[PDB]
Amino acid sequence: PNHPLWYTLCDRYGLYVVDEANIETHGMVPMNRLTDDPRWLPAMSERVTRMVQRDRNHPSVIIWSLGNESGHGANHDALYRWIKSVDPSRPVQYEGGGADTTATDIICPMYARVDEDQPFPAVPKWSIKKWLSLPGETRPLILCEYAHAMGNSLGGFAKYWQAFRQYPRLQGGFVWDWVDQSLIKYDENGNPWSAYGGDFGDTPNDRQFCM
Amino acid sequence: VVLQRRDWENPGVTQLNRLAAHPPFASWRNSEEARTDRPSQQLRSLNGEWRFAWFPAPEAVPESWLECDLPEADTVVVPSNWQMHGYDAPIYTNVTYPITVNPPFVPTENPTGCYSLTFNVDESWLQEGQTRIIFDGVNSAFHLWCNGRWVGYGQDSRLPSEFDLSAFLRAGENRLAVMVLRWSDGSYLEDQDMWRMSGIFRDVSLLHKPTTQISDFHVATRFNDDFSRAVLEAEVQMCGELRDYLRVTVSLWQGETQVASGTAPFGGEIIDERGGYADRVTLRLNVENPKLWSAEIPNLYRAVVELHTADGTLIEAEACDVGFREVRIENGLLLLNGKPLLIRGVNRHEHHPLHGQVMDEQTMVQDILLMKQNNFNAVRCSHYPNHPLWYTLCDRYGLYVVDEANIETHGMVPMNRLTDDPRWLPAMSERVTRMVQRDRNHPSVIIWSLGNESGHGANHDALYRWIKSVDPSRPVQYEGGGADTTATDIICPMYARVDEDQPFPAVPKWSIKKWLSLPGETRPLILCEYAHAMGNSLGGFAKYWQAFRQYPRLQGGFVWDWVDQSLIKYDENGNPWSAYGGDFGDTPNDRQFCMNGLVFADRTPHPALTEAKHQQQFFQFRLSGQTIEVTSEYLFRHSDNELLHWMVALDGKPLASGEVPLDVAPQGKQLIELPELPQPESAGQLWLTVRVVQPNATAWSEAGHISAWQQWRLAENLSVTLPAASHAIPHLTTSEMDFCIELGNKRWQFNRQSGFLSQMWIGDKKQLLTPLRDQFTRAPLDNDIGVAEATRIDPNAWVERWKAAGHYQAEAALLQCTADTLADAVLITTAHAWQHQGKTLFISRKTYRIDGSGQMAITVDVEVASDTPHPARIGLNCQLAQVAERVNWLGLGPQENYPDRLTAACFDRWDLPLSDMYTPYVFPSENGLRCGTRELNYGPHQWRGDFQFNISRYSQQQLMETSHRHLLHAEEGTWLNIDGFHMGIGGDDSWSPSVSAEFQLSAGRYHYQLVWCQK
Amino acid sequence: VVLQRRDWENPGVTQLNRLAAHPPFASWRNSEEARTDRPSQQLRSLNGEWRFAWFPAPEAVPESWLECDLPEADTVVVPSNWQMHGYDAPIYTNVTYPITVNPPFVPTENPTGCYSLTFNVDESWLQEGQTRIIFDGVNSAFHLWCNGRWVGYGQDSRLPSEFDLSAFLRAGEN
């Protein structure tokens, strides 16, 4: 959840908002180790419930999200259902555990390609055009993340938009991401420079992947 | 720290340092011992003699108790509820919380139970591995100290709390200190309609496990379409150091025969982008033609889970019983192994009249046997997870179980105040999740329940979904918020009636037949509670069963309930008596509303049990001519322990009998042709009685067990022959005060002031202590009283309406009293009016005809004002001077039966001791009635007609004036109530009018006739 | 008690004495100001200069700090991240946790920021009603004291934690 003013500004300027719970357990092995554990259901619940209690009157918020990169656990299903019961006015999405689980109203993959399948075991990223028409699938598809804008990037961005326009159920996506997470440091002369991972003696680190 | 944090007034803290929940463990170190389910040396019972001190609050607990035994402490047996040892009072309240409703706070005065044990721990237990303590049941919260050092905290009175003691214990003597709080924030989730007690009331144990251990295992069975093939899937989780040489073997056993086995190293399949569970393994075993588990045939296998090294050294083994069965809902029907269930259920609390809420195997087995013997196949754990042994017994004996979370918030306003609150989601979640974690491997558990009477909140929906995700093998039900919410797979109302709607705002109780077909509704309907068996009850039970059999999607229900929650107290002479709410000085309380059982607290049956047994029979009968058609309602078993016996009797006199083997497939039919019947020249009604008898003993029944019965009327021969012509004629004498009639040594006296038969003589012995008078009232049944809370009086209740109309105070006014002499008899004609405040309620017109054979023919015609509430009965009563040993009748029996509860009763000649004609309901009321009676014999007296009767040492007046059965005193002689007509007893619930219209005495004009003579 | 319970190494304790969550409040006492979304006198910002001291672990925090300003403390702007003031290093890691994966435990060396502020309250607030404090964002957990008395505890770095200060406030400087 963002600084409260963000939602006010989005209400007044006009932007659609996906409001997302502060739950990411990416470093766990496997990713759902905590989210499938009932001992962690109380801690997770508060991150979801208190967001909804805070932000439910904002028109700019059109979709709730259960968090990010926390696999798919039973706690996700429980909290999906909580939100659906408390606030029928907004769909609930969540990408974890393969982007199309029982914890999401929207097929919401990250970096699924337009035509090319990525058949990873357990959590495949199908071509977005293929994904829609998988046996029994009826849901809209909106990428929670796509077109990774790291440095000299956005190659093939036009491919997504052509597909988005041609396929009714391909309803767009969210670019990753808006702003370089660089920090300012100063050299011997006091002149500013842009710093990334590792530049503060921080180790282990992931270098420029923050930008 | 403990006192400062007040963890018992914080629903955010339900535990501190508590270990994860899991299925029952024993840490066997020998594979064979796991296979055979023999006691494990690694699982130590700490049950027995503990030290105990009571305190008014945790603030009153002395510090020295943490390190040293208190001299003022006593030595008591554990497990126990401290109320049962007399330390304070057990409280009976239904809805209203026993504490002020101020969540999450509890009273400053909070009864505290200080438990301690000094005990030895062996050397070997601390050299290696993990030693944990397990508290199966502590009511309602507790802190734990080991050797003076604080260990942890626990809540939820009905699930085990476990703590690691490895770093706390020492070789030699150790001391545990357990501070048990009666009230906690947990109490807000424990508002069940039952005795409010506290203490360490379930087992305490030590369990030693290796550091490298089996920490969890789940067993699933899936099938093909015709159940001829199965896969057993066993997920195994470990704790400790993962090593490449580690292996798990899961073996499956049918007795001594290994049917399947699989071995694998640790490492599950990839589940997401980060990989899989390195600390888990899933074994899949193929099983051909598995023996399937049901309540009908509880086939069990044994699964053994071995943690071992590659080279073959056993580290440890865990094990469970496995029942191969599938539970699913399909096309609106609850299916078991592909077949639609008919739930013959009962709700059962954990209650013992001496030990309170402490359970034992003997009581558990007694209950199961009595249940199965009375045609029950299912139990609901009202309203909490049970003692772990209960599930083992239900697995092995064969009962379908609804396992229910320990969540009830009935006293909240509104009911969902806590359950719709996300602050209470954590505490609720633990009560659901930890139950599923514990009980998921039991085949007997077929349905999960989210609790009871907590309204419908978003927390229910969240937890409904959690269970569906974690365990797809079992439907989830929950009744709160109108019985058909989004948090339930089954329409599961409580006390919804068969035909009658009860359209309460927001939470209506529709007719069950109507409920199924509401626009858009597709789910099965099984009542979580029905036919409230409080005192003289179960009227209309047959109506439910007729509906269940007719409607595919009406799949039965659970009766409320199994056993009266009465407690033993002792009088001045040390004699035990049955007590209820308020008898312990507990106030406020809800009196007798804790006694709703089909059986008494000591497991003696109430009469209603036989009605249940009859209606729940597994064989159905039809008669056409001389053909009996037997239909089996079993889904799986053939009738391979069943013989059908038949008998034809003429007014109780045996004329022909026989026996035929039953060979009926499940759901099949068998036709039995009756042989040529002799034609009785004597007058009277021929009756056919059939019974299904089990010739062979079983685990649950004796040889000769009767499981089903039915009766039909056959040919009747009406009497057209004249009675032997008399020549003696009775002699009438008229005085100012009396009409006197004499014949031989017999005298009849009619009081001319009252217009009643005031006395009869046989020789010099008077026959009456009170005159023969009309009676239109009964000592109110619990159903007539119609209260569920002691504070709430319902003006609509039958007793309130009868009282307000003046029924109990109505005075007989003489309208007519005349005497006439006939050619062979004397005729007395009488008329009376019963009035209240100038309103004529009833008019009774009678003739008494006394003929030369000494028979007194009584003809009664009654008018009942159409605007007065319908009377409880229309009959006569008198106090006979005689006490006699036996009561002999030709009518429905042998047990107590009422108009809306007489299907179990059979027409025959019955002979019982007098005391059996009284039913000792703990709260006294009208009782012991027998209907459809044509002849009654008692001492020198015989009554003939078509009537209902009761006979006993207790007057209706004494019964209505006495609150407890032990306070009843036998009156002089014998009170006889003989009714032409008696109102139904009802019982669809016990807190509103529940007698169906067809059983109300509403006709306005009634006719009955009796003959009184000397035998 | 605070150091003994280790609430920051227990997922069963995510808060102590925290008020219920709710939509944005301002408690306007004038309907027209509520309509036009004008500043409310009942909603006060405590943003600005606070006193701050950095410690390597919570065990290193002196008891004296509960009632007395540490002579070694600096004046800093709040809101802020203390890495941006240079007290310790910000860490950029993608997937791998910045701490050893050992739930629910965290490193013994756990950087601790000790913030304080002395402030006065309108006399009318001391007379009636309920004064609460609102922390819109504290990363990642915190205990709170008011006038040397423990108030409560909160977790989740991205939602407001709110506590009732009514029974803690005094006349003059708090």
Ligand SMILES: O=C1O[C@H](CO)[C@H](O)[C@H](O)[C@H]1O
């Ligand atoms: O509604 C109910 O009926 C019963 C009445 O005795 C008892 O209170 C049960 O616990 C409750 O579920």
Ligand SMILES: [Mg+2]
């Ligand atoms: Mg608590």
Ligand SMILES: [Mg+2]
């Ligand atoms: Mg209740």
Ligand SMILES: [Mg+2]
């Ligand atoms: Mg019958």
Ligand SMILES: [Mg+2]
């Ligand atoms: Mg914590």
Ligand code: NA
């Ligand atoms: Na589109």
Ligand code: NA
């Ligand atoms: Na990145």
Ligand code: NA
């Ligand atoms: Na049915």
Ligand code: NA
């Ligand atoms: Na009851």
Ligand code: NA
């Ligand atoms: Na047979």
Ligand code: NA
């Ligand atoms: Na009575």
